[PDB]
Design a protein around this ligand. Sequence first.
Ligand code: TRP
Ligand code: TRP
Ligand code: K
Lengths: 348, 362
Amino acid sequence: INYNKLIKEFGCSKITENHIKRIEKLTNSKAHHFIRRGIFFSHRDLDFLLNYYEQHKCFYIYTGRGPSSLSMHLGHLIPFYFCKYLQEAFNVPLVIQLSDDEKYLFNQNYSLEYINTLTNENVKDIISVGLNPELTFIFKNTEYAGYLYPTVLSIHKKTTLNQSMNVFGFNHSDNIGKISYPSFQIAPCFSQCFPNFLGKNIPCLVPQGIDQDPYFRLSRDIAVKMALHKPVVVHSVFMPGLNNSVIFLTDTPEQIKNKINKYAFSGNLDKDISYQYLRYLLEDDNKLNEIGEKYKKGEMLSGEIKKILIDVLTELVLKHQEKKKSLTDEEISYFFDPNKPSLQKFKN
Amino acid sequence: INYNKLIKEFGCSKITENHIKRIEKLTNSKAHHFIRRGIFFSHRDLDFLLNYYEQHKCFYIYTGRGPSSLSMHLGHLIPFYFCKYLQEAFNVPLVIQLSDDEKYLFNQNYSLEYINTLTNENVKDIISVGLNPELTFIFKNTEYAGYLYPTVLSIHKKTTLNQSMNVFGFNHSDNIGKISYPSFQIAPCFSQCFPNFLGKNIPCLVPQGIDQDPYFRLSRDIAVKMALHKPVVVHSVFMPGLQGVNNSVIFLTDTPEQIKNKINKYAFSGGGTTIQEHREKGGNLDKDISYQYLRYLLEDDNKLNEIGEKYKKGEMLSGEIKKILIDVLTELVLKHQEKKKSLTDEEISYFFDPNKPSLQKF
Ligand SMILES: N[C@@H](Cc1c[nH]c2ccccc12)C(=O)O
Ligand SMILES: N[C@@H](Cc1c[nH]c2ccccc12)C(=O)O
Ligand SMILES: [K+]
């Protein structure tokens, strides 16, 4: 996949060192390694957002999760780790949508109950990332649709069937729920969908996988029509693989060791899957650079990098499972309260 | 239109004398004149509904209004007079949807605010019909969508885009909100949409204009897929506007004067012809718009029969019938206006409360 080609093809902008310097200046801390290492690499209107934060110290983050399975892996958790950082760095509210409606509509043999099981577990996996419970609002569409609906209607009216089908690749055999859904994913980009804790027309930062862009490329056109702020968009590169070409957060140190040893492509910094995974997982640059140099020059063996990765991954997965098991129902239910005076309520 | 052709074409059935006698038996009161005179004439699954009421003494009514205008007229209020009757006769909950979302999505230049301004007035017109507040729940889709959504999702998933477009005549230029909407009108046909006061899979009676049938022809095929009851449906004929089958209709904002004008200058006369020719010809009830309206407004079958007989035989003048209509209309409209003016904000708010103990029957 040619990312630089995609940026210019769909009208995005590369994240620059200036963006980073301004982020560190405004947050009074070091930028996350996702930004420094170009994992989150492209954006729309980030400059506007940074200036708006500088001038008003106010905005909110919005991301989502589609509960189509019980088994999440690290790639799914990448944007949530990132939202955790943004949440703490700027001290702003985070909003997380669970498109249980989408997964119900797109999966023919799935019922709402099943989707809800998947949803609850995915929610616990997401919370287990380390999100600030005070600065977080999670919602299921099946429950928050009433708060989303007037905004959805405006988006509905400004989206022709032609546009929905062209943008999302729908055909005439798809159910009208699939056609109507994208407005519900677009809606939370507008702060009127959260009257309990947010003011009107507050800029929205949307961290997302690249594959989610069609939703928010459309949201920016409709935002102009609705006379509201265009969603500030931030994209991530797809996490590379190498049928269990992934690391599940239910996996054991044993299975992680086996998968890494037997399947992780080795390589060359750019073809070694393990060094990339370390690019994701290692916060300190010195380490990453040392391992990178030793490996590129030949001093370090493959099985070494494999070992260090297995260690890091093992600690991560174990801590995550611990946090997961630690979760009480009240702790989870707290995340669904929009009435927290707490952070949530200060952004007006 | 040929209604008997429609009945066969779309798989409905005429309401019979057996149905009327049975309704009178179960309600212990005379059947409403809308039924006796074939104004509400066609149905689906009325026998099942009457059996169910005989067995459990309960069901619920569902009808709706699209707030597309500030000025409602008689034809608009026809099914609401009919719902007031059913509500009182059977002693059952009445559910009323205001599809402000529909009218927002179908009218390019209407804001949600303007629409809301419309439905707030439409609601007062609807209530002023004489609905029982204790047995009535009114809701705006813009406010109740959260209660509708899980059911709408199931209906969505069971409707292909092709089917939606073919049933409702949509094209690829229509917004996706218009394609989405029908599931929201279909949703209240299922009691799970009213958890606060309704029980499990309760049979739903939907009185409607004949042009709403595609919604509920679709609701019945979808119920089968959701394993829920098919909506018991009851249709009314179109109320013939003035000037053949402002100002071919009479508004409930009109003054007695305006009604006088409208009738005397625009009511099709049927009998008419030459000043004397009518004395022996004489008067044709089927074409006389006045007698047709009196069919809607006169409860007493005997007055209607007398006026009609005299006007058909020729003794009655077009102007006389005209005048009878002026006074009936005037009384009705004035009464409606007084009732509408008397409405307090709290009385109105009481209609929107889903937690009324009077509604709470499981
Ligand atoms: N539909 C997305 C989940 C999602 C919903 N809202 C979002 C907003 C931003 C990013 C992702 C989302 C998926 O299945 O992957
Ligand atoms: N769509 C109808 C109003 C309506 C909504 N729900 C209904 C249920 C039954 C009959 C009519 C309705 C109209 O504009 O005329
Ligand atoms: K189902």
